[PDB]
């Protein structure tokens, strides 16, 4: 009786949300951007090839200086690269080799990683002993760690396969805030440029907008037909794009609270592992299981280019803060740096 | 056209390369085993004889080092991390023989033996384990012999039309799991009957892994 009444109210509220979203959907992003000129063909060349990983690479993250990057591979090594000279700055042996995510602190003094061990380990790069050592091990997740992003040297937000996200105080090692509401494994998270909000993508084919300070879900975004694997904020922080197993990339707007564009092609039938935007947000770069990275025109939903240089699945990618280059990691155990030429 | 500090940075990078190469060669000589199975299937008893989210066990047997990975505690979606074990030497799958007339505690209607068969075929026929051999352990042999006298195998297998003896019932169950192999050319299933007091389980794994090592050597050398 009471339980039956409540579940009917949830359906009515969902209908109210759907009608409200349809009310404000006066036009389409494709119609608005129909007039603008296309970006043409985007051609990029492999400037650098980062060799040294002897297993599949699952994660990479650029530093804020747009020169240092960290890569996570399941050979049990966390490697920090000098992308300019391909020099290996550090090689961090991991206690658990089943690492699925890695992060670079915006200060550059710390890197994080975590995988099937359910632990987010914080590594100190600036020590008086001259070696990289573990500063903290963040325990409390009951599922594998799928993504993590530093807010500062003391705060980090992590997502897990236990359907929850957590905000941690690194000094104390405890999760100050827990983000619940996903009904499937959370696979990715992306911090807003102001680090006041972040979006997460889970296996329930939904994306959620979270308030970091308040600790509650603000908006929920649906539309994908399968697990969301990648998520990335637009540069202005008013939109984000997701990558899912249904071979589609979709763009959602926070203020519109609805999907604005779908980035799909008939020849593309494989899952999407990683998504990232260019500096201006005009280009949406996505990694796929078909061993390629496709460049998308975010405003016009046209494939602008293809980064085909990997012999296995492209598992990760990232664009530098200055937009100068894009790095792609892959299961073929290589990282490549890409940029265009005049 | 490097500076004095650039040259020393390159020298540091090559020292890192030397240690990465050393670690990879050490890692290539090690045996990685993905230990799978259902609950109360004797899977934990296997670890006890071979002394977070994933439990990793290391043991050395006859100049060979084994890495056994237990993913029983990972209650998340298997398909999101099962591909992380693509490349293991083999898979050890534990099946409780005595759990044929029993039913799942939660479902209360699905047979425990069929639950193992359903999990066995979703792992054996998985796309990430196309050519990965399976070391199939059939545990609780002594308990199965006691139960077969009272509870016939026809409760689990209605199509079974053999004698109500261990020597024939155990063979029928062994063939049922092997018949689930959807690719009988790229992989082989090594079936062993273990128990709670057996001491030849580690010896069997060494024999089965040795065959996998030979098979991979033949492929790399071009003979196969």
């Amino acid at each position: 009786s009471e339980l039956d009444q409540l579940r009917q109210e949830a359906e009515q509220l969902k209908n109210q949300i759907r009608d409200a979203r349809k009310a404000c959907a006066d036009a389409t992003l494709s119609q608005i951007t129909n007039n603008i000129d296309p970006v043409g063909r985007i051609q990029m060349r492999t400037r650098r090839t980062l060799r040294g990983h002897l297993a599949k690479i699952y994660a990479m993250h650029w530093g804020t200086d747009s020169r240092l990057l960290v890569s996570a591979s399941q050979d049990g090594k966390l490697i920090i690269w000098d992308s300019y000279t391909t020099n290996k700055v550090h090689a961090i042996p991991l206690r658990s080799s089943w690492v699925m995510t890695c992060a670079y602190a915006p200060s550059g003094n710390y890197v994080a990683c975590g995988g099937l061990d359910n632990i987010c380990s914080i590594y100190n790069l600036k020590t008086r002993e001259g070696n990289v050592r573990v500063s903290r091990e963040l325990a409390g997740h009951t599922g594998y760690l799928s993504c993590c992003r530093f807010l500062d040297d003391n705060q980090i937000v992590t997502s897990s396969g236990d359907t929850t996200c957590a905000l941690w105080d690194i000094e104390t090692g405890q999760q100050t805030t827990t983000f619940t509401g996903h009904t499937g494994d959370v696979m990715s998270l992306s911090l807003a440029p102001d680090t006041r909000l972040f979006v997460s993508g889970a296996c329930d084919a939904s994306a959620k907008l979270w308030d970091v300070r308040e600790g509650m879900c603000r908006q929920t975004f649906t539309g994908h037909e399968s697990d969301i694997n990648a998520i990335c904020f637009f540069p202005n922080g008013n939109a984000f794009a997701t990558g899912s197993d249904d071979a589609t990339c979709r763009l959602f707007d926070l203020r519109a609270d609805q999907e604005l564009m779908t980035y799909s092609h008939d020849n593309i039938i494989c899952g999407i592992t990683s998504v990232s935007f260019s500096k201006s947000g005009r280009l949406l770069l996505a990694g796929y299981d078909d061993f390629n990275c496709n460049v998308w025109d975010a405003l016009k939903a046209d494939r602008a280019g293809v980064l085909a240089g990997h012999d296995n699945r492209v598992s990760c990618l990232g664009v530098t803060d200055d937009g100068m280059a894009v790095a792609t990691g892959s299961w073929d155990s290589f990282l490549k740096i890409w940029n265009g030429s005049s | 056209t490097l500076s004095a500090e650039d040259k020393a940075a390159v020298e540091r990078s090559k020292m890192i390369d030397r240690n990465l190469r050393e670690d990879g060669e050490k890692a290539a000589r090690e045996v990685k085993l993905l230990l799978l199975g259902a609950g109360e299937s004797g899977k934990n008893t296997i670890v006890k004889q071979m002394k977070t989210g994933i439990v990793e066990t290391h043991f050395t047997f006859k100049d060979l080092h084994f890495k056994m990975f237990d993913v029983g505690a990972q209650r998340s979606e298997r398909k999101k991390w099962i591909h992380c074990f693509e490349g293991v030497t083999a898979i050890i799958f534990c099946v409780a023989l005595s759990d044929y007339d029993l039913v799942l505690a939660e479902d209360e209607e699905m047979n425990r033996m069929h639950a193992s068969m359903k999990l066995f075929d979703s792992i054996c026929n998985n796309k990430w384990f196309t050519d990965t051999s399976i070391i199939l352990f059939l545990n609780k042999k002594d308990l199965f012999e006691e139960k077969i006298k009272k509870s016939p195998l026809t409760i689990c297998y209605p199509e079974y039309a053999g004698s109500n003896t261990y020597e024939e019932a155990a063979a029928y169950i062994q063939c049922q799991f092997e018949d689930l192999n959807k690719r009988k050319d790229t992989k082989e299933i090594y079936t062993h009957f273990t128990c709670s007091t057996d001491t030849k389980n580690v010896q069997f794994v060494f024999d089965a892994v040795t065959d996998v090592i030979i098979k991979n050597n033949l492929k790399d050398c071009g003979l196969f």
Partner: single-chain antibody
Amino acid sequence: DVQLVESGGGLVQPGGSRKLSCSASGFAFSSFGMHWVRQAPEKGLEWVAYISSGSGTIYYADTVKGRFTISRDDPKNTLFLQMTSLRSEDTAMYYCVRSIYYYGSSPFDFWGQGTTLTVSDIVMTQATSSVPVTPGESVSISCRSSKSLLHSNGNTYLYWFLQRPGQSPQLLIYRMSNLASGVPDRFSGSGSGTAFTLTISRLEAEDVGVYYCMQHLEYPLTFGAGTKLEL
């Protein structure tokens, strides 16, 4: 804590041989390149020899090449300087210096206390030998080089060291602009090309000492004469 202890110094006869040892503790010794830098009595700093991490690269000063041998024992965390045919020119306090080389690192960050041995090329110029100073007053120290220390990679390999009286040299500025860890922000390094300036705002008592500028553009590493601040 990071510690470098030198031993083996003492009075020797001319033409003899002496062995210097440097004991390292509190840091990853095998990951650091090691230097020997000597200082003759009432004289400036003089670089002697360098052995890289892993013993792959070795450099010597011309005044000591052929007679001095630098070696390291990574398991025992010890640095060695075997010296032969010792002359009166070799009478100096020898320092054990650690330096690690990767992108963004700070070489020459830690110096040993040094051992005294008694025996019975880019030019760095610091014209101003002494500067009368008062607390709370801004002081600028100038350094010059014969060759431009700016490299094509964008770095200007100029280092500043402060040797307080009775103490080992202390790194202040590395690569001409970056502040070493643990150094107050009042120290600042500025320069361009061949001329460089070290600015000390709100001078204090601890800032009293001799300031050296070293170049790391190429070997041999050379120091300036040294600018002394006195009250």
